[PDB]
């Protein structure tokens, strides 16, 4: 009757960036043991996380308000002939969510970012829905899921007056607060140095992009930002 304890390393996350980690369920559990993943001392996971029982994947997309350390408890329980879940083990680790940062361009060299304005509200979306949205943007951005940023609109600014390239989407009315899905194109680029973006601009205006993403597209723009 020698019980085994499993340690899980602490994780790190960044606001607006996808987060996904594999949980070693095989070590924590055995043939007939039920796995439970949630915030330590709670029945549910933090609002930004999602647990996939069959793939053993803890994933999510943190908002500015999820900044901080989150203690996640993974426990294994056995079913009693009575149907009652008997606590057997429990490993606990944390995930620190850093402020909108991004874990490159020469310091003084601004980043060329392509942004897509969407008529959506991240606070009204489950983490899974936030992940799926990013996933659906790959066909157009040609940038891996973990390399795209997705954050809410602030102070109702649905545009960047400093963009040197921009185009319209399919939406005529913006109903939700709005969301910004962006990604890096290069360093200190201009209209000529920028790659071919027709694959973004065309679908956006025609409605093919919104049809794939599942949300209306307000427009897109390309601008150079100051490093941080």
Swiss-Prot record:
O-glycosylated. POMGNT1 catalyzes the initial addition of N-acetylglucosamine, giving rise to the GlcNAc(beta1-2)Man(alpha1-)O-Ser/Thr moiety and thus providing the necessary basis for the addition of further carbohydrate moieties. Heavily O-glycosylated comprising of up to two thirds of its mass and the carbohydrate composition differs depending on tissue type. Mucin-type O-glycosylation is important for ligand binding activity. O-mannosylation is found in high abundance in both brain and muscle where the most abundant glycan is Sia-alpha-2-3-Gal-beta-1-4-Glc-NAc-beta-1-2-Man. Glycans are attached at residue 82. It is found in: Secreted, Extracellular space. Residues 1-228 are annotated as: Required for laminin recognition. It comes from the Eukaryota. Disulfide bonds join 105-187. Extracellular peripheral glycoprotein that acts as a receptor for extracellular matrix proteins containing laminin-G domains, and for certain adenoviruses. Receptor for laminin-2 (LAMA2) and agrin in peripheral nerve Schwann cells. Also acts as a receptor for laminin LAMA5. This is Alpha-dystroglycan. The lineage of its organism: Eukaryota, Metazoa, Chordata, Craniata, Vertebrata. The chain holds residues 58 to 303 of 893 of the full protein.
């Amino acid at each position: 009757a020698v019980p085994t304890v499993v340690g899980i390393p602490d994780g790190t996350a960044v606001v607006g960036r996808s987060f996904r980690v594999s949980i070693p369920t095989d070590l924590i559990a055995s043939s007939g043991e039920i796995i439970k993943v949630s915030a330590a001392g709670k029945e549910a996971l933090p609002s930004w996380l999602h647990w996939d029982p069959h793939s053993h994947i803890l994933e999510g997309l943190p908002l500015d308000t999820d900044k901080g350390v989150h203690y996640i408890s993974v426990s294994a329980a056995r079913l009693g002939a009575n149907g009652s879940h008997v606590p057997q083990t429990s490993s606990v680790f944390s995930i620190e969510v850093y402020p909108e940062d991004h874990n490159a361009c020469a310091a003084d060299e601004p980043v060329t970012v392509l942004t897509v304005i969407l008529d959506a509200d991240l606070t009204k979306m489950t983490p899974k829905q936030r992940i799926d949205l990013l996933n659906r943007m790959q066909s157009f951005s040609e940038v891996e899921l973990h390399n795209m940023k997705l954050v809410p609109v602030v102070n109702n600014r649905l545009f960047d007056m400093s963009a040197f390239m921009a185009g319209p989407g399919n939406a005529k009315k913006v109903v939700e607060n709005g969301a910004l899905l962006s990604w890096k194109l290069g360093c200190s680029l201009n209209q000529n140095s920028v790659p071919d973006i027709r694959g973004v601009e065309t679908p956006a205006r025609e409605g093919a992009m919104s049809a794939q993403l599942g949300y209306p597209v307000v427009g897109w723009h390309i601008a150079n930002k100051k490093p941080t």
